Ligand binder design. Structure first.
Ligand SMILES: CCCCCCCCCCCCCCCCCC
Lengths: 130, 423, 48
C-alpha cells in the first residue's frame, strides 16, 4: 500500500508534518550534513512530528513513498538595514554564540577606553600642578 | 590553451568560469558534475544462509551396536544413544547443510578496501557541449572529442562504508562479522562457505541432539535459531538510510552513488579553434546597472539591468568576478543600443560585485533583503563568509563604537606627551 | 481535517454542507476500471 500523503508546515528552521494513517507505517529521516543523526519510528493513527532542519538539511521518507529532500533558508524576523534593535534581533536569533560575544567585547572596549582616559587626565592634573 | 580551477563537488549545480587569453574574446565555461560514485575494491570471505539440517532417517540396530564416526560433512552431532525403543541402538546424525534455497536468500560478508572517484562531467565551452567521465585522480585524462580533462585529488577523502560489510538481498550493513573459520554459534556466521556451489561448509551451529523417548521412531533435536535468521530480526537500518552525505547505495559492484563532499580541482586543456579574436568580438563601451529585487539566499533572487553600447550584433558573454554573487545564463545577445537583464544569486546581504559584459568591467552596488519563505526544494548555491555576510550599517555601528572606544585613548596618550614634555 | 467538526451543516436537513477531509484522488493503474483515493479519517470518530 501507498500511505496517505502527509501534510507539512514550514516553520523557521524546522518542519512540522501532521500524519494520519491506520496501518503502521515507517517514518525514517536523516540530516545531510556531516553528522547524519538518523531516526526511525513506526506510527499509527494521528500525530504531529517536529524536525529541526538546517542549512544542509533533512531528507525524510515516510512509508514506502519515494524520498523527499528539503533545504532551509536564512530567514529571520528583523532587518540588517535598520535601527540597532532590528539588527541584533536578526543576528542573535540566527547566531547567538557570536552576537553576545561581540556586544560584550564592544562594551568592555568602551569601559577600558573611558577608564584609562579618566585615570590619565587625573594624572595630568596631578603632575602638572606643583 | 590551459586553464585550471576547482569545481565544488555538489552534483547538478552548474559552475561558471571565464577563460580569457589576450587578443581573444573571453569565452564561457560551465562544468556541471552530473554523477559521481566512489567504488571500493571488495573481496568476499564467506556466504551464509539458514541451515536446513539434514535430519536423515536414523540408523537403528535392534540388537547390534553402532559406532558412527564423521563423514566429510558439516556440523553433526553424530550421537549414538544407547538403550532405546524397547540392547537396541540409534545413531542419529542431524548434520547441517545449506537450506533448500540459498540462490534466493543468502548473504555475502564482503570486506572493503579504499575507494576511487569517478565523475560524469558535462562541460560546455563556447557553443559546444561535451559529455565524458573522468577518474578523479590527478593523472588519467578523460577526453572529449578534443579537450583533455584531468581532475585533481580530492580535498578530503571520505567513505560511507567501513572495513567490514554485509550484503543481503539488496541492502548494505556496517556490521562486524566474525573471521573465516573462527565463528561462534547463535550469532551471524554459523555456516561459512566460500561460495554457494563449492564444497567445505564449516559450521558451529549450537545444534543439540537429544535422547529420544517416544513410542515411535523420531529424532529430537533442539537448536538455537540460525544466526542468519536472528540477524534478520536484529539488524537496524541499512546503509541506504544512514549514509552520512545523502548518498544512495546501489550494488552490483558496491558503489556509493551521488555523494556530496569536498571539491575537485579540474585542470582543463581547451582546444584552439573555439576562441575568436577581439577583431571579431563586438566592442562594448560604458556599462551601467540598475538593480531590482535582491531577495537573497534563495536560488536566483536577483535582477539587474545591463545598459550597454556596442558595435555589431553578436553574442557577448557575462561573468561576475567576485565570489559573493554568481549569475546565470552566461551569454547575452547584445545589440547596439539596448538593456538586457541578468540574474544575480547572492547569499549575503550586500550585492557588491563586479560584472564584465564582454570585457568591460563595472560594478553592481545594492542592498539585499531576507526572504519570506522558510523552507525550499533547492540547495544553496553559495557559502557564507565573515566580512561579507555582515551588513554595511552594522559595520558602521561597530567601527563607530569600537573606534570611539580608542580615539579617546589616542587623546589620552597625547595627554601623556603634552603633560610630560611641557611640565 | 481529522478533528472534531469536519462536516458542518446548520441543521439536520438544511443544505450548504461544508467539509475538509484531505481527500486526494489518485491515478488509476490497473486492468479494470477503478477510481482510487486516499483520505483522512473521520474526525468525529476520533473524538468518541
Ligand atoms: C560559519 C560562518 C560564519 C559566517 C557568519 C558569521 C556571522 C557573524 C555574525 C555576528 C553578528 C554581528 C552582529 C553585530 C551587530 C552589531 C550591531 C550593534
Amino acid at each position: 500500500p501507498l500511505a496517505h500523503v502527509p501534510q507539512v508546515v514550514h516553520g523557521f528552521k524546522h518542519i512540522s508534518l501532521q500524519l494520519d494513517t491506520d496501518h503502521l507505517t515507517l517514518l525514517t529521516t536523516r540530516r545531510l550534513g556531516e553528522k547524519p543523526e538518523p531516526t526511525s519510528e513506526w506510527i499509527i493513527g494521528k500525530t504531529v512530528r517536529n524536525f529541526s532542519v538546517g542549512r544542509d538539511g533533512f531528507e525524510y521518507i515516510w512509508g514506502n513513498h519515494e524520498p523527499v529532500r528539503v533545504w532551509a533558508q536564512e530567514s529571520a524576523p528583523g532587518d540588517p538595514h535598520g535601527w540597532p534593535h532590528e539588527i541584533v534581533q536578526h543576528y542573535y536569533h540566527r547566531h547567538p554564540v557570536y552576537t553576545v560575544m561581540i556586544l560584550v567585547a564592544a562594551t568592555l572596549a568602551i569601559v577600558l577606553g573611558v577608564s584609562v582616559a579618566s585615570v590619565c587626565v587625573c594624572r595630568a592634573r596631578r603632575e602638572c600642578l606643583t | 590553451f590551459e586553464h585550471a580551477t576547482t569545481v565544488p563537488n555538489v552534483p547538478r549545480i552548474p559552475y561558471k568560469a571565464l577563460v580569457e587569453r589576450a587578443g581573444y574574446a573571453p569565452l564561457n565555461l560551465e562544468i556541471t558534475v552530473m554523477s559521481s560514485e566512489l567504488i571500493p575494491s571488495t573481496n568476499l570471505e564467506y556466504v551464509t544462509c539458514k541451515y536446513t539440517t539434514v535430519v536423515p532417517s536414523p540408523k537403528v540396530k535392534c540388537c547390534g551396536t553402532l559406532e558412527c564416526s564423521s563423514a566429510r560433512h558439516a556440523d553433526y552431532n553424530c550421537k549414538v544413544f544407547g538403550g532405546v525403543y524397547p540392547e537396541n541402538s540409534q545413531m542419529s546424525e542431524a548434520y547441517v547443510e545449506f537450506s533448500a534455497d540459498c540462490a534466493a536468500d543468502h548473504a555475502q560478508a564482503v570486506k572493503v578496501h579504499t575507494a576511487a572517484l569517478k565523475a560524469g562531467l558535462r562541460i560546455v565551452y563556447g557553443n559546444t557541449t561535451s559529455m565524458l567521465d573522468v577518474y578523479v585522480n590527478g593523472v588519467t585524462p578523460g577526453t572529449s572529442k578534443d579537450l583533455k580533462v584531468i581532475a585533481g585529488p580530492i580535498s578530503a577523502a571520505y567513505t560511507p562504508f567501513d572495513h567490514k560489510v554485509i550484503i543481503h538481498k539488496g541492502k548494505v550493513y556496517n556490521y562486524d562479522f566474525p573471521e573465516y573459520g573462527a565463528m561462534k554459534p547463535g550469532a551471524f556466521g554459523d555456516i561459512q562457505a566460500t561460495s554457494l556451489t563449492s564444497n567445505d561448509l564449516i559450521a558451529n551451529t549450537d545444534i543439540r541432539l537429544l535422547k529420544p523417548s517416544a513410542k515411535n521412531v523420531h529424532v529430537p533435536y533442539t537448536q538455537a535459531a540460525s544466526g542468519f535468521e536472528m540477524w534478520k530480526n536484529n539488524s537496524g537500518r541499512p546503509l541506504q538510510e544512514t549514509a552520512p552525505f545523502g548518498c544512495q547505495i546501489a550494488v552490483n559492484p558496491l558503489r556509493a552513488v551521488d555523494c556530496a563532499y569536498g571539491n575537485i580541482p579540474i585542470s582543463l586543456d581547451i582546444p584552439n579553434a573555439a576562441f575568436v579574436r577581439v577583431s571579431d568580438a563586438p566592442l562594448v563601451t560604458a556599462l551601467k546597472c540598475e538593480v531590482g529585487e535582491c531577495v537573497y539566499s534563495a536560488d536566483f533572487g536577483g535582477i539587474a539591468t545591463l545598459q550597454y553600447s556596442s558595435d555589431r550584433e553578436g553574442q557577448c558573454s557575462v561573468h561576475s568576478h567576485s565570489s559573493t554573487a554568481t549569475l546565470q545564463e552566461s551569454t547575452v545577445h547584445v545589440l547596439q543600443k539596448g538593456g538586457a537583464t541578468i540574474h544575480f544569486s547572492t547569499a549575503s546581504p550586500q550585492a557588491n560585485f563586479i560584472v564584465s559584459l564582454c570585457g568591460k568591467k563595472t560594478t553592481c552596488n545594492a542592498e539585499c533583503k531576507p526572504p519570506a519563505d522558510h523552507i525550499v526544494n533547492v540547495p544553496h548555491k553559495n557559502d557564507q563568509e565573515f566580512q561579507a555576510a555582515v551588513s554595511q550599517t552594522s559595520w558602521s555601528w561597530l567601527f563607530a563604537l569600537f573606534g570611539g572606544a580608542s580615539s579617546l585613548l589616542v587623546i589620552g596618550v597625547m595627554i601623556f606627551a603634552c603633560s610630560a614634555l611641557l611640565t
